[PDB]
C-alpha cells in the first residue's frame, strides 16, 4: 500500500525514468533528488529560471519479474543524504549529483554515508519481495529548515534502492530484472523568475 513519509501530506504529470537492469551481482542505486528532474521536462525549465522553489514528491518503484525469480529490495527515502569519500578527501561531483540516470553504490553496506544499512529502516521505506509484491510507493513531503531553497544547489533527499537479498534464477530465465521509477511532483511552487 502507499507509504506516507512522516505522516504529512505535501500540502501547501508522471515522469518515467529509464530502466535499470538488476543482475545477480549489482550493488544498488541512489537518485538523490530535486535533481533528477532538473534537466528533463517542463519541471526542469522552471528549476533553472526561478530563484526559489518549494515542492513535494511522489515516487513509485516497480519491478517486473516472473514467479521463478527470487530476491528482495529495500526502498528508502533519506533526507539530507550526504555522500562520503572512502579514504585511500572529497566525493566527486558525479557522485554528489548523479543526474537522471542515478549512481551505483560503491559500498552498499555503509550506504556511503558511514551509517549502517541495518538501521536504514528508520527512514521511510518499503520492501519489494518478489514473491509477495512487485511495487513500492512513497509520498514525501517537503522537509527543510527554510520555507524555500534553491533547486540546483541543494538536494532535499535521496532515494535509495539496495538489493538486500541477491537475485537468483535457474538456467533459461531472463538474466536481468528491469527496475523502473516514476516521479510525480506534488504541490510545487516557484518564485524569483
Amino acid at each position: 500500500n502507499i507509504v506516507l513519509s512522516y505522516g504529512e501530506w505535501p500540502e501547501y504529470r508522471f515522469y518515467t525514468l529509464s530502466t535499470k537492469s538488476w543482475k545477480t551481482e549489482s550493488t544498488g542505486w541512489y537518485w538523490k533528488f530535486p535533481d533528477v528532474l532538473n534537466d528533463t521536462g517542463v519541471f526542469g525549465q522552471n528549476a533553472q529560471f526561478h530563484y526559489l522553489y518549494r515542492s513535494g514528491f511522489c515516487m513509485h518503484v516497480q519491478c517486473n519479474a516472473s514467479k521463478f525469480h527470487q530476491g528482495a529490495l529495500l526502498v528508502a527515502a533519506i533526507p539530507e543524504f550526504v555522500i562520503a569519500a572512502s579514504s585511500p578527501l572529497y566525493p566527486d561531483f558525479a557522485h554528489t549529483n548523479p543526474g537522471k540516470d542515478g549512481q551505483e553504490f560503491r559500498d552498499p553496506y555503509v550506504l556511503d554515508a558511514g551509517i549502517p544499512l541495518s538501521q536504514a529502516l528508520v527512514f521511510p521505506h518499503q520492501w519489494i519481495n518478489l514473491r509477495t509484491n512487485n511495487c513500492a510507493t512513497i509520498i514525501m513531503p517537503y522537509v527543510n529548515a527554510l520555507p524555500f531553497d534553491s533547486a540546483l544547489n541543494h538536494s532535499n533527499f535521496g532515494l535509495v534502492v539496495i538489493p538486500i537479498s541477491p537475485l537468483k534464477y535457474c538456467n533459461g530465465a531472463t538474466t536481468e530484472v528491469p527496475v523502473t521509477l516514476t516521479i510525480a511532483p506534488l504541490n510545487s511552487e516557484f518564485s524569483g523568475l
Binding site: 579514504s87 578527501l89 555503509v110 551509517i115 541543494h154 538536494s155
Partner: protein, 211 residues
C-alpha cells in the same frame, strides 16, 4: 518514561574545550580565541547526529585555574564575538573595547562565570547534515557557526603565568527532528563524513551460526 527523552537525552554539562592563554614561555601572547564547536569530541558528535535538525539554547561555564591548581586573584576578560564580527589581533587590540561584543570581567578567585547564548542561526534550526554546495564546500553550511570566545588576562605587559580554562556547555530547551542512524564507522576528518577504506563490522564475530 521521562528518563529517555530528547529533552533528557541531551542534558547535563559536558566539557566542550580546553584552552590556555600561555603568556609565560616563548609564547608571550596572553590571549586566546576559541571558536564555539559542539562536535569537538567524537562522542558528543555521535549523539547530536541522531537528529538532522536541532534548535537549542546554550549555557557556558568557565572553570579557570593556574597550572598548580592555585587560583590567586587576578582579573580576566571573557569576551564573546558573535558571528560576523572581527576577532582580536593581540592583547592590546582595540577589538576588546567594542561595545557590541558582550564581555565578562571575573577574577580567578570567584565562582566560575556563566552566560547563556540564544539560538543564533538564520535558518529555523541547526542542521548537522547539509546536502549540496552553499555558494571542498560540499556539505558545509555557514549558518551553524555560533561565534567565538576571546579570553585574556587584563594587564599592561607580560604577566609571567599561564592560565588553563575548561568550558562546560549545557544544551537547553532542545527540539529535534527527523531521526537518523548512529554512525558505525570511525570518524577521520573533522567536518566531513569520510571513513576509512577498511570496513569494520557492526556485530562481533562468532565461530559458527549455530553458536
Amino acid at each position: 518514561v521521562n528518563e529517555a527523552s530528547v529533552e533528557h537525552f541531551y542534558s547535563r554539562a559536558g566539557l566542550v574545550g580546553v584552552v590556555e592563554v600561555k603568556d609565560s614561555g616563548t609564547s608571550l601572547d596572553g590571549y586566546t580565541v576559541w571558536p564555539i564547536d559542539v562536535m569537538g569530541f567524537v562522542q558528543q558528535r555521535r549523539k547530536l547526529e541522531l537528529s538532522t535538525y536541532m534548535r537549542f539554547d546554550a549555557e557556558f561555564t568557565f572553570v579557570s585555574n593556574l597550572s598548580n591548581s592555585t587560583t590567586p586573584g587576578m582579573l580576566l576578560q571573557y569576551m564573546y564575538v558573535p558571528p560576523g564580527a572581527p576577532k582580536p589581533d593581540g592583547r592590546k587590540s582595540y577589538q576588546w573595547q567594542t561595545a557590541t561584543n558582550p564581555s565578562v570581567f571575573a577574577k580567578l578567585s570567584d565562582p566560575p562565570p556563566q552566560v547563556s547564548v540564544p539560538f543564533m542561526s538564520p535558518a529555523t534550526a541547526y542542521q548537522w547534515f547539509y546536502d549540496g554546495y552553499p555558494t571542498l564546500q560540499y556539505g558545509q553550511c555557514p549558518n551553524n557557526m555560533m561565534g567565538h570566545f576571546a579570553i585574556r588576562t587584563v594587564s599592561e605587559s607580560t604577566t609571567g603565568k599561564n592560565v588553563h580554562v575548561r568550558v562546560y556547555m549545557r544544551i537547553k530547551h532542545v527540539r529535534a527532528w527527523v531521526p537518523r542512524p548512529l554512525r558505525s564507522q570511525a570518524y577521520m576528518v573533522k567536518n566531513y563524513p569520510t571513513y576509512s577504506q577498511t570496513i569494520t563490522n557492526t556485530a562481533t564475530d562468532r565461530a559458527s551460526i549455530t553458536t
